[PDB]
Amino acid sequence: TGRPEWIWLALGTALMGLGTLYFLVKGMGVSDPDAKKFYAITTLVPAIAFTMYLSMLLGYGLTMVPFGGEQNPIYWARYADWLFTTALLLLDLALLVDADQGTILALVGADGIMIGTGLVGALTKVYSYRFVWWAISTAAMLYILYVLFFGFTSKAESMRPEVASTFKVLRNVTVVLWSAYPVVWLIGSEGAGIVPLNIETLLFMVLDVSAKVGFGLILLRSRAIFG
Ligand SMILES: *C/C=C(C)/C=C/C=C(C)/C=C/C1=C(C)CCCC1(C)C
C-alpha cells in the first residue's frame, strides 16, 4: 500500500518497542515489590502500543467509514490500544497517590466510556452525529482530568514531597497531552478532515510516545515508586 503516514507508524512502533524493552529490563532487575508493580504496569503500556502500531503499520486497524460524501480512512486499532493503555496510565497515577478503590473504579469506568464513545463516533456514518459521540467522550475525559487535578493532587499531599512532586509532573504531562487528543480528532480524519491523515498520524505518534514512554521514563526513574 505505502500510505503517506506509514513512516509515522514505523517510528511509533520503533519508539514504543524500545521503550518497552528498556522498561522491561529495568523492571526485572528490581527487587522492591511496589517498584515491581509500577514497572509491570508501565512496561505493559508501550508493549500494547507497540503491537497496535505494528499492526497498523502492517495494514490492520484501518477501516473506511463513509460520511461527508467520502470514504474516510479511520484507524480503529488506536482505540484497541488506548482502551487498555489509558486505563493503565490512570492506575499508575492512582497507585501513586494511594487513591481509593472507588476512585480507581470510577476513573477507569469513565475512561472506558471515553474510549468507547470515541470509537463509536469514529465509526458513525451520520456526520453531525460523529460529533455528538465525540462530545460525550470529551466530557468523560474532562471528568477524568478534573479528578486527577482536584482529587489526586489533594491525596498526593498525604505523600512525601518526593511522591507529591513526581505525581505533579506526571499529572501535568497527562493533563497537557490528553487535552490534545480531542482537538487532533476534531480537526483531523475522524472529524472536520482539515488536517490530513499523514500529519494526523504524526501528531498522534508524538502524543502517544510522550504520554507512554515520556510518562514511564519520568515515573520509573523516580524513587516515589518504592514501597
Ligand atoms: C497512550 C495513549 C494515551 C495517553 C491516550 C490518550 C487519549 C485520549 C485522552 C483520548 C481522547 C479522545 C477524546 C476526548 C474524544 C474523541 C476521541 C478520543 C478517544 C481521541
Curated annotation (Swiss-Prot):
The chain crosses the membrane at residues 6-25, 40-58, 76-92, 104-123, 131-150, 169-187, 200-219. It is found in: Cell membrane. GO terms for biological process: phototransduction; proton transmembrane transport. The keyword Transport applies. InterPro entries: Arc/bac/fun_rhodopsins, Rhodopsin_retinal_BS. The record marks 81 as: Primary proton acceptor. It comes from the Archaea. PROSITE patterns: BACTERIAL_OPSIN_1 (PS00950), BACTERIAL_OPSIN_RET (PS00327). It is a multi-pass membrane protein. GO terms for cellular component: plasma membrane. Gene3D superfamilies: Rhodopsin 7-helix transmembrane proteins (1.20.1070.10). Residues 26-39, 93-103, 151-168 are cytoplasmic. Residues 59-75, 124-130, 188-199 are extracellular. Disulfide bonds: none annotated. GO terms for molecular function: light-driven active monoatomic ion transmembrane transporter activity; monoatomic ion channel activity; photoreceptor activity. The covalent binding of retinal to the apoprotein, bacterioopsin, generates bacteriorhodopsin. The modification N6-(retinylidene)lysine is found at residue 212. The keyword DNA damage does not apply. Keywords: Cell membrane, Chromophore, Hydrogen ion transport, Ion transport, Membrane, Photoreceptor protein, Pyrrolidone carboxylic acid, Receptor, Retinal protein, Sensory transduction, Transmembrane, Transmembrane helix, Transport. Homotrimer. Light-driven proton pump. Belongs to the archaeal/bacterial/fungal opsin family. This is Bacteriorhodopsin. The lineage of its organism: Archaea, Methanobacteriati, Methanobacteriota, Stenosarchaea group, Halobacteria.
